[PDB]
Amino acid sequence: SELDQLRQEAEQLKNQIRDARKACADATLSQITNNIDPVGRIQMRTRRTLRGHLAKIYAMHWGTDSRLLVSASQDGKLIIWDSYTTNKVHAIPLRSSWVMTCAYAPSGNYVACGGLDNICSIYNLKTREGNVRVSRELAGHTGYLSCCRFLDDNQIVTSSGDTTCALWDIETGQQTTTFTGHTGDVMSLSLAPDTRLFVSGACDASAKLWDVREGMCRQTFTGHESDINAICFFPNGNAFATGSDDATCRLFDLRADQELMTYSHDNIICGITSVSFSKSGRLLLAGYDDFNCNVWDALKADRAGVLAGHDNRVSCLGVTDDGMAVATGSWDSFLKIWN
Amino acid sequence: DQRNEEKAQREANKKIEKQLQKDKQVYRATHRLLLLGAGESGKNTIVKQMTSGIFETKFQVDKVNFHMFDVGAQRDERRKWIQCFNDVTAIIFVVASSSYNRLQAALKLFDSIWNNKWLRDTSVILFLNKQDLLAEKVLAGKSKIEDYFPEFARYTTPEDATPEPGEDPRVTRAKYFIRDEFLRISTASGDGRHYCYPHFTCAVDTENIRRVFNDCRDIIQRMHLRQYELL
């Protein structure tokens, strides 16, 4: 059978890649940072507690001004907060309450959200009338929306439970490109700082690097044992971190094409739900199923801090563009700002 | 100046806050339900008797609002999107009892739902559907349940069982055996957090909307008794 001819040949292509990466792995990140001094103990306190959501929060996203942020809760609400004064700026009621992701446009004029409705809805924040209404409804995913991120006012990338990712032209509402490498549900995506690439993690325990303008999968990363739930780019765009249900976080490098560091502990037996780096990339913050957030020294793989305020599962966390504050959403319906 | 903005922002926040209080009363009054089941289980028939990624059904029993959600355009892998329904009042699980092997597959799905970390406090209203089809398969006698379930040979109808009038004891023994296969999973990890409410149903039973209401009332009662450490 020719199906075995192609299944035994791909095995050799997996052995060739395994040895091509093995040769590049001359040293490990741990020994190169065996001499750098640790960050110490990181103590962050809750500065703001954003209340107003009725049900569990699933996603949040900072604005580019590092002050405004949007949060999505499964009671069917998008709330735009002023993190300084804790004042709500907008409260957008959603058509479908089973929202799983939200996004802030870099211009600050649009927000996006989506979930089990299989639709990415775009809202106009700055209308001439002064209201917030739906600008576009992007349909074309056959599975639930897991993540969405704006490239600009007219382009947004979405990841879906139907195992694909897609790039949308917002004004026309049509998929410009489609990314069909994964075999499991895609759970999260992260745009490179130059917005020319993006990485996505799926439920096949793998992550993939995509060319936005070309539409191809450049690199595929493995190493995790279970579903990848979270993914985030390193500040320089040359690396990214993934959090999985196998209770570990891992760091990958694009140019080395392999995992550099694993952030784990023997007492941690719960999955990671969200990851984000600090402004310099020295800190890797991760939310966990056990209601806590762990601050990881991304260079030494040592745990440096813990944010312990949340009553329930931590769903999301974001770092401001100026690195001043960290937000955390949780299933307890509260958002906490930590400095 | 800066002071004028803080005034105008404080006005917008209070207007949003009054709307949120109104939303809180509407949200806390509706009871959300997840409807699960195979393609041949008959749940789509129970839906109409009472492509988007999810479908909604809003019905009312005794002036109580119920919001039933049916999964539409999703893949058969549920381990991710099923976590969204951890806060529903109950999960309505529909099983085709006459499908003895869809029945073992339904037993396996019930086991993973029952033992899921995020669904541990969610009760399950279990509909053992297609009871009329099960009667025709046992009365005919062409296919023995003992083939796919060899423990049916040594199984006797329990004494607490209440067979319907005009029912062949072979049918009563068959349908109560299937119920016990599910109850063996339910009573192994109950622990008082959640409970399974099994019902022998038919896809056209007009009393199905009442079984959900009566089970949801029992679920909320056990939730209140739990907040006072009474039960």
């Epitope: 499991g184 044992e225 579903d227 249900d245 196998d246 | 892998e77 993973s112 033992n115 899921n116 970390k117």
Partner: nanobody, 128 residues
Framework: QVQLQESGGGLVQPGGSLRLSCAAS????????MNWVRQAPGKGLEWVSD????????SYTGSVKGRFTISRDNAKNTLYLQMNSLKPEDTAVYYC?????????????????????RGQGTQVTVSS
């Protein structure tokens, strides 16, 4: 890289014996529940048997009780399905399926059409 490689199988007579083996790689074997699933010709995937992390709790589909015995050697990272007194209806491709998450009591999606943590399979043929 999670990989499951099923061995054994082939042609056998009714009442014969076949011992299926599943070599695991790329994950801590002991932290995971393991399953056996099969796909008969022209039919869907069916769960056959599973075994807990340590090997104490064991379950079977009724049609193979008294005939098939599942076991695991965590030190050897291997799953086994000893199949005694085979019947012609036991002809199928047998897949060694891993459970998606570690340290869990639930085990979702192991019989899905596109499940990721499943091997390619091995063929078992029981005929005259």
């Amino acid at each position: 890289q999670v990989q499951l490689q099923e061995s054994g199988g082939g042609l056998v007579q009714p009442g014969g014996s076949l011992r299926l083996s599943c070599a695991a790689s790329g994950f801590t074997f002991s932290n995971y529940k393991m399953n056996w699933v099969r796909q008969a010709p022209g039919k869907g995937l069916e769960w056959v048997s599973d075994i807990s992390q340590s090997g104490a709790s064991i379950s079977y589909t009724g049609s193979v009780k008294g005939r098939f015995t599942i076991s695991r050697d965590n030190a050897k990272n291997t799953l086994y399905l000893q199949m005694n007194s085979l019947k012609p209806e036991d002809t199928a491709v047998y897949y060694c399926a891993r459970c998606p998450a570690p340290f869990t009591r639930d085990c979702f999606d192991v019989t899905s059409t596109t499940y990721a943590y499943r091997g390619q399979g091995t063929q078992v043929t029981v005929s005259s």
